[PDB]
Amino acid sequence: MRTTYMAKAGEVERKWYVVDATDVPLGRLSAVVASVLRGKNKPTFTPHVDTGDFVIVINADKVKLTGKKATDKIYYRHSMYPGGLKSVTAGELRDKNSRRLIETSVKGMLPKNTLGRKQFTKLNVYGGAEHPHAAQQPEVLDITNLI
């Protein structure tokens, strides 16, 4: 019959969630956040349209890295110039720029396309407990049971 529902851009209301990363393993935090950003948690999920919600991650500096990941998990990046390989440990990123740590982890899990990049932009990470998005009236999203 061709009656399956297909969400339209702008008709679905995107909410704002606050996720506290304190002592949550990095990957598990990223996985739940990625599902929310894609909108997999809502029945109106339509793969070709953005329907996920905005996420504000707080206390990024307290994210948990099990095992020896803090010093042995290495993030590489190549400048595209010969021998232009740069490396930085996950622990160092957490200490100095934890926003990048969370963002990189979540980028790896979102789709690598236009919709995926747009969905990533809805992510906001803040080391520390306070954020400037109170105007959006975000609500807490407990993830203790989701992880």
Binding site: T3, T4, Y5, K40, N41, K42, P43, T44, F45
Partner: protein, 59 residues
């Protein structure tokens, strides 16, 4: 349909796998197309189906 049914089941306190197992136990043959339709539109009817599935699982 499976993804949408999964989202709706989670909102009702159930995973997709548990929901479908419960529905099979409860003898409900509504297919995934119709289930997804109920989830998106008739959330009340979907909740009734989910409650029957949970009841069947408990038994």
């Amino acid at each position: 349909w499976i993804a949408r049914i999964n989202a709706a089941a989670r909102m009702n306190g159930l995973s997709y796998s548990k929901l479908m197992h419960g529905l099979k136990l409860a003898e409900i043959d509504i297919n995934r197309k119709m289930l997804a339709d109920l989830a998106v539109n008739d959330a009340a009817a979907f909740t009734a189906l989910a409650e029957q599935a949970k009841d069947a699982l408990s038994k």
